Amino acid sequence: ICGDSTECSNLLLQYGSFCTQLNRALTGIAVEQDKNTQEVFAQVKQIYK
Amino acid sequence: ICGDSTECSNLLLQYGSFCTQLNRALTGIAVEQDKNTQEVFAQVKQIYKTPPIKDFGGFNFSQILPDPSKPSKRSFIEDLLFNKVTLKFNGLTVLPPLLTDEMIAQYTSALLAGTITSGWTFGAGAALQIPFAMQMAYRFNGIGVTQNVLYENQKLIANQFNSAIGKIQDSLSSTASALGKLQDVVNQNAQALNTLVKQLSSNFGAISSVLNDILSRLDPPEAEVQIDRLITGRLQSLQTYVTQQLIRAAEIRASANLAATKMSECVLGQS
Amino acid sequence: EAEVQIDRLITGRLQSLQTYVTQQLIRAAEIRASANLAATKMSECVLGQS
Amino acid sequence: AYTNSFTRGVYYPDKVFRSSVLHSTQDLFLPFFSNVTWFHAIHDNPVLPFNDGVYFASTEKSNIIRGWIFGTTLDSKTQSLLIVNNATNVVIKVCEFQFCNDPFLGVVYSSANNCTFEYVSQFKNLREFVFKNIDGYFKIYSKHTPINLVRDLPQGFSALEPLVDLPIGINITRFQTLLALHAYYVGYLQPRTFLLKYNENGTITDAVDCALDPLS
Amino acid sequence: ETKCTLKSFTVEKGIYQTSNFRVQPTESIVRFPNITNLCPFGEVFNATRFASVYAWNRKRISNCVADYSVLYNSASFSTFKCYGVSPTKLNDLCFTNVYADSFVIRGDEVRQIAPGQTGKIADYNYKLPDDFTGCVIAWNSNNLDSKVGGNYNYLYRLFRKSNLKPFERDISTEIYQAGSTPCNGVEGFNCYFPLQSYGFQPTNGVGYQPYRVVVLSFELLHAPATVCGPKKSTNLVKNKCVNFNFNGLTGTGVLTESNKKFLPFQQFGRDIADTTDAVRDPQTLEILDITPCSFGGVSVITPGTNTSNQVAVLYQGVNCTEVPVYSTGSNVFQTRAGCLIGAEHVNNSYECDIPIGAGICASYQTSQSIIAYTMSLGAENSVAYSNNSIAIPTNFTISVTTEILPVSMTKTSVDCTMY
Ligand SMILES: *[C@@H]1O[C@H](CO)[C@@H](O[C@@H]2O[C@H](CO)[C@@H](O[C@@H]3O[C@H](CO)[C@@H](O)[C@H](O)[C@@H]3O)[C@H](O)[C@H]2NC(C)=O)[C@H](O)[C@H]1NC(C)=O
Ligand SMILES: *[C@@H]1O[C@H](CO)[C@@H](O[C@@H]2O[C@H](CO)[C@@H](O)[C@H](O)[C@H]2NC(C)=O)[C@H](O)[C@H]1NC(C)=O
Ligand SMILES: *[C@@H]1O[C@H](CO)[C@@H](O[C@@H]2O[C@H](CO)[C@@H](O)[C@H](O)[C@H]2NC(C)=O)[C@H](O)[C@H]1NC(C)=O
Ligand SMILES: *[C@@H]1O[C@H](CO)[C@@H](O[C@@H]2O[C@H](CO)[C@@H](O)[C@H](O)[C@H]2NC(C)=O)[C@H](O)[C@H]1NC(C)=O
Ligand SMILES: *[C@@H]1O[C@H](CO)[C@@H](O[C@@H]2O[C@H](CO)[C@@H](O)[C@H](O)[C@H]2NC(C)=O)[C@H](O)[C@H]1NC(C)=O
Ligand SMILES: *[C@@H]1O[C@H](CO)[C@@H](O[C@@H]2O[C@H](CO)[C@@H](O)[C@H](O)[C@H]2NC(C)=O)[C@H](O)[C@H]1NC(C)=O
Ligand SMILES: *[C@@H]1O[C@H](CO)[C@@H](O[C@@H]2O[C@H](CO)[C@@H](O)[C@H](O)[C@H]2NC(C)=O)[C@H](O)[C@H]1NC(C)=O
Ligand SMILES: *[C@@H]1O[C@H](CO)[C@@H](O)[C@H](O)[C@H]1NC(C)=O
Ligand SMILES: *[C@@H]1O[C@H](CO)[C@@H](O)[C@H](O)[C@H]1NC(C)=O
Ligand SMILES: *[C@@H]1O[C@H](CO)[C@@H](O)[C@H](O)[C@H]1NC(C)=O
Ligand SMILES: *[C@@H]1O[C@H](CO)[C@@H](O)[C@H](O)[C@H]1NC(C)=O
How far apart are CA E316 and CA B93, in angstroms? Predict the structure, then answer.
């Protein structure tokens, strides 16, 4: 929403701290996807042939 | 969003009836949590009591059964769990749960005494007494191993059981960080509320974040614009908080339903 | 000035509609979960024995 | 001569009591592990630029380092600040005084042209000071309690508290120390971010920089 | 109120949330720093001697508190005036620096001390610029200056009487070149003698009797202010919902004794989100603690319109020693989740009908009244477990139960341009 600027960056930090929870939610989603895949497939301890 | 100011209410009254929506959603989710706890724990229509004298064929249940010594009548593992995990300013109130802790403890004790003395017969009608060894024989027949095995190896199994329960008690007592999920839930709730109350002191592009001063230093023609900016910013933040709470409530509902299924199936019977 | 007035009205109505849509989505998701549970119950307890 | 400042120069930013809280502050401070221009002025008094407040340290247990001259022209054209010690009375004069080649003072005056304000107030001891001038307010901090973590070098952790504050409202960009007629460090401050851990009684006990290392 | 909030003419059994209450504030307390050193103003307006008009004394007053009320409300001065600001507000004004100009002039010349004025005093003696003037005060000096015998001791810078032509009756010019010599100027052979004298004879007449005039000018916006006026002081009250500014920072709450210990240089403590928690009062130099005034939503427990028309009122999370019919008269019951009025408390226990919180609930079910009791977790029995005893059923029953599940909801489509 700023695109490598200074005035926009100054105006952005005056609106509060929305971006913290935005980034937190996105990172939580990514971690959840990794957990989903690992828990679905990793169900054995050894490797058989 | 007003902080005891008349003209703030005068401006706010023209935005509609959103507050009814917010309060309705919050009351709905609170009632739903109450129903969740009720449906998870209320599974028995009596409260059984274990006999004063205990001889369970050699098994030792002293660390699990409730202790009359503790005034709360909570067992050893309950005390360890409660001591392990550790956790009203401007309109942010917290209501107490309907079911206090002692009632939950009584429910758990009744369930455990019923599943020791009667088996799974109290999950379909009236409790039917049965000696413990002749219940373990049925449970071994349930998995394909003939009952002849149990009666000839009773002492070894009793020692195995006691040693395993001692080891799990020691593991819970010493090793921490095994209770991550509840700690994460508590931390998420506290952090969300804390950031919501932190949001209060942002400028939002107005002149200042203190409303009384901004009124006392100006006149209506532009004080109207400044107050309108502050109001819309605060309302947006509140709406975002409510939506996040709704999502978290849905997730907790799914988890509680799974827990209720597990409690109903793996306790009152055999899976 | 008519443009300013319509701007205010439009932004207000847009916010209201967005809130309504979000609530509808949440309710639909919950109802879908309940429908899946009902389908499981019907398929398992009626066509066989539990 | 140069020296490395281990962890010196942390001060109470404001006048707000706190307890057992980790607080992040964004102000001007002396960065950790910085270069201090150690001087050995025994038998020089160079004039040094101010540049938005300075850290000062000294360890002399006698009456030699007494005054400080502040200004940007050091002439009668514009007012200048004189802050001298007298062992019984601290006199501060912001009036106009003309040029001086090398002052001799200790227990220089040119004139009192356009004089408009004057104020009066009250291992060795490690004198430490921080001088700031911002939005017309002149602030002097201090710490006169010495800590001997190591010898011959200023190591240790301590906090600084305000002593005076003056509404001079003057533009100063240059200063000069004082002696009489016959080993003080220097440091410059930068707009840094710090994380402070308050004690239970409300005293600073730990600080962490935010522009020094990935762990930070 | 329940019918209003629900917007219906009938209500069913249950608990409803109508509105909220908030304890109203009370008298206010205002405080400031303890005491400021008074400047010696009596050495200015009430000195034993003054200066001549051509050498009017100018002095600087700063870095203290100035009380203009005592000199303004006392009718001991002949002429009192102020420009730009009413005198009564000088006790609540702050300025950078104050300049006092004192002299003695005749009675008629007192009207010439104002911006834009003309005359011998204005052009040569006291040149007031055309700008706002702080305050001009004047008082008669016939009691101490002229009566004692000083009828000639004051000189005034009129002009040199050297280089003017007869333009009018009074030969008055602004060409005052000489006058630097302390002997009123030497024109070679005393050709011209400037700096004429005042004839302050007490019996000559009040028209030109000596009058002491002092003019106060204020320095604005050159630097942060150092002098202010006397501020209004009041006492304090405890254990009351009070609004205050308390030496600078506003706040509404209840005061209490505190246990925190401060370092000698703090002013007030906080916890988070700029919420003050402990403050110190400079007059008493004591630390007090702040607690927010109580509030909370109300609720009504009702058995339904059909059965009866009486309800119980529950206040949430308030110690209801002071809540103010259903305000003080009806019976009160303090729970862990607030306190309720209108319903009695019995020691028995039954099944639960209308949940309340903290393990209790209220209904009439086990006479035309609402009773609140502690819910019972169920029945009670003990099974006689013994190591050689079993129980085997002999008869059976078949029971049909019902379960209900929703599977769909209405499909709605909303246009965007139309709405
Ligand atoms: C701080 O530094 C600034 C330099 O940028 C100094 O400001 C300048 O001070 C001179 C003083 O003579 C000002 O000139 C005067 O301006 C007034 C208008 O207010 C005018 O009426 C006078 O005739 C004269 O020209 C000059 O405008 C001013 N410039 C700025 C940009 O402020 C200032 O003196 C320094 N601070 C101190 C305390 O000296
Ligand atoms: C069941 O296990 C508990 C483990 O705490 C036993 O309690 C201990 O028993 C030993 C010997 O009987 C005593 O020396 C300890 O002092 C007991 N613990 C405490 C805290 O007092 C209990 O005896 C076991 N029960 C049976 C029947 O074996
Ligand atoms: C905080 O200050 C107190 C006193 O100013 C320090 O001394 C403590 O005082 C309390 C109250 O009498 C005693 O109970 C403690 O035993 C005292 N402590 C010691 C070490 O003597 C105290 O040390 C300071 N620091 C803390 C963390 O409390
Ligand atoms: C500060 O204000 C107080 C209260 O008006 C003045 O009274 C003194 O208060 C202190 C406590 O803060 C007491 O220890 C003294 O005994 C009080 N003095 C008297 C004479 O009662 C106090 O004088 C004020 N301080 C100054 C410097 O004016
Ligand atoms: C509500 O506040 C009152 C105080 O007005 C509390 O009364 C307490 O009563 C006991 C019994 O004598 C005293 O020892 C306490 O000192 C009182 N409290 C105070 C703060 O003085 C009452 O307990 C409070 N209600 C609840 C539920 O806590
Ligand atoms: C089987 O025997 C047990 C123990 O004798 C019976 O339990 C008692 O039943 C009587 C009948 O009213 C009660 O008064 C006692 O309180 C029961 N004892 C306990 C410890 O609760 C049981 O009733 C017998 N079975 C049947 C079908 O009567
Ligand atoms: C099991 O219970 C049923 C009822 O629940 C008994 O059937 C009843 O028998 C009596 C006596 O013959 C009749 O008067 C009733 O009409 C019967 N009930 C019904 C619904 O038909 C049955 O007798 C019981 N079993 C035994 C072995 O006694
Ligand atoms: C400075 O100190 C000397 C002696 O200590 C004293 O006589 C003198 O008055 C002091 N100066 C001032 C301005 O007080
Ligand atoms: C000095 O103050 C007293 C006190 O009111 C007053 O009566 C008197 O007139 C003053 N002196 C002069 C010369 O005004
Ligand atoms: C009240 O309840 C009775 C019994 O169920 C019913 O007949 C009657 O219609 C009800 N009246 C109202 C107003 O609900
Ligand atoms: C609880 O029982 C005691 C014992 O008699 C009695 O005094 C008390 O009134 C009972 N509680 C209530 C609410 O009546």
Answer: 10
Within 10 Å of residue D138's Cβ, how many Cβ atoms? 22
Question: Which candidate from A11, A14, A16 shows the least CB-CB separation from B199?
Answer: A16
CA D57/CA D6 separation, integer angstroms: 14
Characterize the bridge pairing of strands D34-36 and D3-5.
Answer: antiparallel
Nearest chain B residue to A20 by CA distance is B195
Q: Of the bound ligands, which one is closest to the alpha carbon of residue E306?
A: 10
Q: Which domain CATH number covers D133?
A: 2.60.120.960
Most ligand 11 atoms within 8 A of CB, residue of E334, E347, E374 to mutate: E347
In whole angstroms, what is the distance from residue E20 CA to residue E330 CA?
A: 20
**In contact, E87 and E68? CB cutoff 8 Å:** yes
A19, amino acid identity: C
Experimental method, per PDB record:
cryo-EM
Does ligand 6 have an atom closer than 6 angstroms to the CB of E384?
A: yes
- Token pair, residue D70, equals 């502040």
Interface of E with C (CB under 8 A): 403, 405-409, 412, 414, 416, 419
Provide the domain count of chain D.
Answer: 1
CB of E301 closer than 8 Å to CB of E356: yes
Give the domain extent around D30: 2-216
Resolution in A: 3.5
* b/e map E362-375, b = 16+ CB within 10 Å: bbeeeeeebbbbbb
D neighbours by CB contacts (3+ pairs under 8 Å): E
Name the residue at shortest CA distance from atom 5 of ligand 8.
D88
Tokens (6 digits) for E240: 């009351």
Of D19, D48, D26, D24, residue with least CA distance to D36: D48
